[PDB]
Write a protein that binds this ligand. Structure first.
Ligand SMILES: Cc1cc2nc3c(=O)[nH]c(=O)nc-3n(C[C@H](O)[C@H](O)[C@H](O)COP(=O)(O)OP(=O)(O)OC[C@H]3O[C@@H](n4cnc5c(N)ncnc54)[C@H](O)[C@@H]3O)c2cc1C
Ligand SMILES: Cc1cc2nc3c(=O)[nH]c(=O)nc-3n(C[C@H](O)[C@H](O)[C@H](O)COP(=O)(O)OP(=O)(O)OC[C@H]3O[C@@H](n4cnc5c(N)ncnc54)[C@H](O)[C@@H]3O)c2cc1C
Ligand SMILES: NC(=O)c1ccc[n+]([C@@H]2O[C@H](COP(=O)([O-])OP(=O)(O)OC[C@H]3O[C@@H](n4cnc5c(N)ncnc54)[C@H](OP(=O)(O)O)[C@@H]3O)[C@@H](O)[C@H]2O)c1
Ligand SMILES: NC(=O)c1ccc[n+]([C@@H]2O[C@H](COP(=O)([O-])OP(=O)(O)OC[C@H]3O[C@@H](n4cnc5c(N)ncnc54)[C@H](OP(=O)(O)O)[C@@H]3O)[C@@H](O)[C@H]2O)c1
Ligand code: HEB
Ligand code: HEB
Ligand code: HEB
Ligand code: HEB
Ligand SMILES: CCCCCCCCCCCC
Ligand SMILES: CCCCCCCCCCCC
Ligand SMILES: CCCCCCCCCC
Ligand SMILES: CCCCCCCCCC
Ligand SMILES: [Zn+2]
Lengths: 603, 603
């Protein structure tokens, strides 16, 4: 009640207030001025925080200044936090359309209220700001892996401790740290196999067990090896000093030097520099570490055997003939937001399902480094195979920098990935876009469009075109694309491709639509009447000015899930999603009531 | 010279002569009578063995008896060793056609000579009979596997012998036989894995190393295990008797009993009876043999480990969910020559390349027995998947007998086999039929015919049909089928299917032929003018009377290889064969001169 109002007042410097009000900013300054002479009196805040008619009148007063200034105000709003990256040339047309829709003098409060009610008023907002047990429980409810490693470490430490309890306070620590080190130095290698991980990635084992964070888990076990080796060294030295009142010590010293080298020369700072050769050559010293530790520990080979032989087999299966091939880059083009687009020539013998990935390796950038990239070209394209890479690290950033200022060697190794025959062998399989790996969705869309157009048979004689039914390739009659991601900051390639496919199939939607686009932001701006300008623009040119697409990029977080529940039926409809377990689980639980054979969280 | 004639006479009883002359036999008796009063005088043999005019006159005299009898003679010749299984109803038409072609009186020797010269005369023959270092070198020039096993056995026996030479004449034999037995009892199991063998079958390792005889090699090592175990037992007993002047002996006795049981109850005689359950249950005692031999030999577990764990993994990978599935037989039909044809319902999720195989298992016949069968139905058939089985053993014979006098459970386990994308992604890939596994060729032919007809697009509006080009499925323009096998004794299903496909595509050969058939026997009858009757019959009904097909089943062993060399070119022609290494090697060596990318001996 009144106490709540007092607390809100206590929660509350014009420039400081503007800065703290989530600034863009002429509109913000005008609103702050309209919010008297300028003071910290709580009456203005109470009035602002308190029917929709008053809010509409306040908004109308804020928009005006005493109505050509609205065009300048509209331009400022576009350049504001709305992130509307549009040219100023179209601003005149948008302002003219808005003035025509509003004035028909543009100072009429009643006209503004009617225009607002045409589309809202209840959502009277003028700001977006307010003015680790739960997270761990939520994340660990499906991970349950770090605790297992900790339990193994502790049980091994205790088991070695009970075996040397008689020795006094120094050698039992040594033995426990030692046994932990056999375990760690034996299995930190079996973590990383780039070959079998792909084979395991396409199974329910990968569905239940996370895989994509194996780099960070491997680095974490490297760190614990370093720490435990240091404490083991200190314990053995303090034991020797106590005894002070020839191969073991020198071999331990050599192992310590090797681990210190591998820790120093494999940190993030080294690979920040373009000395990938230095990192790889220093990091090839794992063989020397294993060889030294063989005849350093009495029973290290027992631990080393199984993972050692299995990793030796995994590395020995890779030859130039076995998987590798020589591919020459044909054309490379750089797109905005530091995304590089490659056009590698298709080898004569390469049949790949859509959505598969491959590992690229450019000798010029990194001589012996391999990174996975997802194919962004349809399998029906016989000329070139595309690859799309976003600069989210150093090596990709290195490629972008190098190509900033072509026939260079490239090596690709086969297609790998989950089979996509289930999507084509379905009826109205809707695809939901989430996460950062939305590259395979472009391949799937291109393949589906190509197969759809291949059945558009036209008779050359009488110029009659009749559509044949499904023929042994796909069984879909309609596909729905729904994209729910952080932004379109780096996916200009993907936006362009989806827009291209959309108006390529838009010429065929008069008799029946085949592809639907639902593009969401959930972070765009509602609270400011910027969409009023675009309302007329969308029908002015039959395409959104921000995208040049039939879809106008509607935001909305939960209403998208509700529409997914309310998604027309061309057959046994199926729902497929790809993202974090939270959103996928919510969508599945909502979808389970509707009786749909939906394999949600498929990725 | 004259000495050769004397030797030929020495190489030489009218009934006995007829029996030894490769009898069918009225024609044989007439020839023997025509060959005087009947004696062993060498003048008749000298005349017979010695221009084509004399041979033609002799043949004309033999055919006649003093010409309606020729029809009876023709019928006898058809029923003779020619193996012409044709009805007597068509004999009248054939005899009438032959008489019309010959007489126009049918006793004119000059007319017979002219008719023979029309088609021969130089190949004047009236008989087909004459009147292990080389084989081992030829076979072992590519096998080199039994010698390796013998060498391993001998080196192990010698190694154990040198380790116990001090012991007197009895225990060194024991130790050598023992070490040989660890080796044998460890690897006789790693021979047989029905899972990894399929994975290895599709590689060049299977191309160089034979695989299909693993049953017989496994049985041979079982036999040597039995023999060496018996001699080991005798040696240890004679050692103990010498010492005669408690777990080892009883465990050895138990192992001896188990091996004797497994030898007795797994012989051919037991499975000759329909007691497959008895064989399988008695043969499940290998686990007991291994368990007893673990704590019977001091160092048997070292040998047992790797093959034991690997076989345990191979058997543990097989579950009902993992590979197995429930399939109900829809229709079963029995064809002549003891071949059974099955029509099993296609499971909803089953995509298989043509030519793949599967393992059938009928609980009614054998509860826990598995045998591989090759799919004889095109992948484009969505209704049922075929299987063709020839009664070449007991279990198949058991199935034939049981179905001689349906909804029974059947279990299939996936498709396995070499990929066939290379055939479709080629130009004029000619297929050569040899060996006994010609079942996948029917699947390949059906798939190629179906894909060829799927591009025969006809406009419904104006009834105009235009053929489209190759579309992402195959790149062939012409396929040639050449069949060089022992007979058509059991392949009536395959003959019917190829004939069906041929006249299905015969309606499209006027503008361009798509499938060519070259059916050979190399064992049929030349020497007897039976083909004269069929010469008119072939054009009488546009189909051979023996087959009802455009092809008339031409024989000829080496001329087929010459024609394969002289095989028209619709693109980059490729040659594929399947059979024993001899014929395939000859065909490849002949083909290498022509510069054809032929992967001969592909099977
Ligand atoms: C199977 C797979 C396919 C991918 N496909 C694409 C794609 O098509 N387009 C795209 O823009 N991004 C893709 N990524 C994400 C990422 O951009 C790529 O893995 C890229 O190779 C990053 O390399 P980097 O040199 O920048 O890594 P770094 O900058 O050296 O490492 C930092 C980041 O890269 C990851 N990383 C580093 N090394 C590896 C490695 N060996 N394996 C996996 N992750 C590693 C780390 O987890 C971390 O997130 C994919 C990731 C995976 C696992
Ligand atoms: C991969 C493969 C696919 C085959 N496909 C066909 C087909 O489609 N049609 C056809 O008519 N024949 C086929 N055969 C040949 C043979 O007829 C089948 O293997 C059939 O299962 C014979 O079983 P059986 O009970 O008569 O064997 P048995 O009578 O018990 O054994 C005698 C013969 O069968 C073979 N044999 C026995 N057990 C096995 C086994 N477990 N694995 C392999 N061979 C064995 C022996 O080598 C010997 O030649 C195939 C063989 C193989 C290896
Ligand atoms: N290999 C992989 O697939 C992989 C690897 C690592 C992590 N991940 C996933 O990626 C996540 C990190 O990326 P993220 O947080 O951006 O994605 P996310 O966790 O998969 O999804 C959460 C985001 O989805 C959006 N969202 C929520 N409800 C929505 C609705 N009704 N309609 C539309 N969008 C809705 C929200 O806004 P925004 O759209 O603005 O974000 C929210 O931030 C991780 O939590 C994990 O789930 C995947
Ligand atoms: N899994 C397998 O693929 C498998 C397994 C075991 C054995 N095999 C092969 O099968 C063989 C046993 O069967 P097989 O001897 O009947 O076949 P084959 O050895 O493959 O072929 C030999 C036969 O080919 C025929 N032939 C020779 N020259 C010919 C020509 N120019 N044109 C047409 N035919 C010609 C001959 O008469 P016929 O046609 O009257 O025989 C000859 O008997 C083995 O030697 C081995 O090569 C294959
Ligand atoms: C035990 C031994 C060892 C150790 C000690 C280690 C230690 C370590 N680690 Fe290591 N790694 C290893 C073993 C190792 N490691 C190996 C072997 C490899 C290769 C890969 C695979 O395996 O696959 C690696 C790899 C690796 C990587 C990647 C590379 C590539 O990819 O190329 C990384 C990042 C790491 C990290 C690490 C670190 C940071 C450390 C320190 C702390 N590594
Ligand atoms: C690389 C990691 C590492 C390192 C760094 C080290 C370092 C060392 N080290 Fe060592 N160790 C080890 C690893 C190690 N290490 C282990 C793991 C063990 C346990 C045992 C085995 O392994 O077997 C030991 C153990 C050990 C021993 C023994 C114990 C028993 O036996 O129980 C000794 C004497 C030692 C010494 C040493 C020294 C003195 C040093 C410093 C110089 N070393
Ligand atoms: C070392 C142990 C052992 C031994 C002693 C034997 C001995 C023998 N073996 Fe034995 N097996 C065996 C181990 C064996 N095994 C096994 C484990 C099997 C199963 C199969 C597999 O592995 O996969 C058989 C299997 C078997 C078979 C097939 C069956 C089925 O498939 O189901 C046969 C035929 C035999 C034979 C034989 C004989 C005849 C003998 C006597 C001589 N084989
Ligand atoms: C199953 C097959 C078999 C059988 C049948 C047998 C049978 C027998 N066994 Fe014997 N063992 C054996 C297998 C055997 N086993 C072997 C493999 C050996 C070598 C050693 C091990 O294993 O480790 C022996 C060895 C042996 C020994 C020891 C020698 C050494 O240590 O060097 C003895 C004492 C015996 C006894 C015996 C007897 C007395 C008999 C008869 C009863 N074998
Ligand atoms: C910090 C996240 C830890 C995730 C651990 C991943 C474990 C991967 C196991 C791979 C087994 C082959
Ligand atoms: C009598 C013919 C002997 C053939 C030997 C075959 C050997 C098969 C080796 C299989 C290795 C997995
Ligand atoms: C035996 C001690 C293991 C410690 C593991 C701690 C993991 C921390 C992850 C941030
Ligand atoms: C150690 C003795 C091995 C004998 C092998 C003989 C093989 C014969 C194949 C017919
Ligand atoms: Zn037409």
């Amino acid at each position: 009640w009144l106490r709540w109002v007092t607390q809100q007042f206590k929660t509350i410097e014009i420039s400081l207030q503007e800065f703290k009000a989530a600034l863009h900013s002429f509109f913000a300054e005008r609103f702050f001025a309209l919010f008297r002479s300028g003071t910290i009196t709580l009456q203005e805040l109470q009035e602002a925080l308190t029917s929709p008619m008053d809010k509409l009148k306040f908004l109308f007063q804020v928009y005006d200044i005493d109505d050509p200034d609205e065009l300048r105000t509209v331009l400022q709003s576009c350049l504001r936090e709305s992130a509307i990256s549009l040219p100023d040339e179209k601003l005149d047309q948008l302002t003219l359309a808005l003035f025509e829709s509003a004035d028909a003098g543009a100072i009429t409060f009643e006209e503004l209220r009617d225009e607002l009610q045409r589309f809202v008023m209840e959502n009277l907002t003028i700001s977006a700001a307010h003015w680790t047990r739960a997270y761990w429980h939520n994340h660990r409810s499906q991970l349950f892996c770090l605790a297992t490693y900790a339990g193994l470490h502790v049980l091994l430490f205790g088991l070695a401790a009970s075996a040397h309890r008689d020795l006094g306070a120094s050698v039992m620590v040594a033995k426990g740290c030692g046994q932990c080190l056999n375990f760690d130095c034996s299995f930190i290698a079996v973590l990383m196999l780039r070959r079998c991980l792909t084979w395991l990635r396409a199974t329910w084992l990968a569905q239940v067990l996370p895989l994509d964070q194996n780099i960070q888990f491997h680095q974490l076990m490297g760190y614990v090896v370093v720490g435990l080796s240091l404490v083991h060294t200190v314990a053995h030295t303090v034991n020797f000093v106590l005894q002070a009142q020839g191969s073991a010590s020198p071999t331990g010293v050599a192992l310590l030097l090797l681990l210190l080298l591998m820790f120093i020369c494999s940190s993030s700072c080294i690979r920040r520099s373009g000395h990938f050769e230095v990192f790889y050559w220093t990091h090839l010293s794992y063989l020397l570490v294993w060889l030294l530790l063989i005849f350093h520990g009495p029973n290290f080979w027992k631990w080393l055997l199984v993972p050692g032989i299995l990793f030796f087999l995994e590395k020995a299966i890779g030859l130039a003939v076995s998987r590798m091939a020589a591919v020459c880059i044909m054309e490379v083009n750089l797109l905005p937001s530091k995304v590089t687009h490659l056009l590698i020539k298709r080898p004569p013998f390469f049949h790949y399902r859509p959505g598969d990935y491959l590992y690229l390796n450019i000798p010029t950038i990194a001589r012996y480094e391999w990174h996975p990239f997802t194919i962004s070209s349809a399998p029906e394209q016989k000329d070139t195979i595309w690859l799309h890479i976003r600069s989210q690290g150093q090596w990709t950033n290195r490629l972008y920098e190098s190509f900033k200022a072509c026939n260079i060697k490239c090596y690709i190794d086969g297609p790998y990935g989950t089979p996509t025959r289930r999507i084509f062998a379905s009826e109205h399989a809707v695809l939901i876009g989430a996460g950062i790996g939305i590259t395979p969705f472009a391949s799937i869309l291109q393949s589906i469009m190509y197969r759809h157009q291949k059945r558009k048979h036209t008779c050359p004689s009488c110029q009659h075109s009749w559509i044949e039914g499904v023929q042994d390739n796909m069984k879909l009659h309609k596909v729905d694309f729904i994209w729910i991601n952080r932004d379109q900051r780096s996916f200009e390639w993907f936006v362009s491709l989806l827009t291209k496919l959309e108006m390529d199939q838009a010429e065929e939607a008069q008799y029946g639509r085949f592809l639907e686009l639902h593009m969401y932001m959930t972070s765009a701006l509602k609270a400011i009447g910027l969409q009023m300008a675009l309302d007329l623009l969308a029908n002015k040119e039959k395409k959104d000015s921000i995208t040049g697409l039939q879809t106008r990029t509607q935001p909305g977080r939960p209403d998208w899930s509700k529409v997914f529940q309310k998604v027309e039926k061309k057959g046994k409809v199926q729902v497929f999603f790809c993202g974090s377990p939270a959103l996928a689980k919510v969508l599945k639980g909502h979808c389970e009531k509707f009786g749909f054979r939906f394999f949600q969280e498929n990725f």
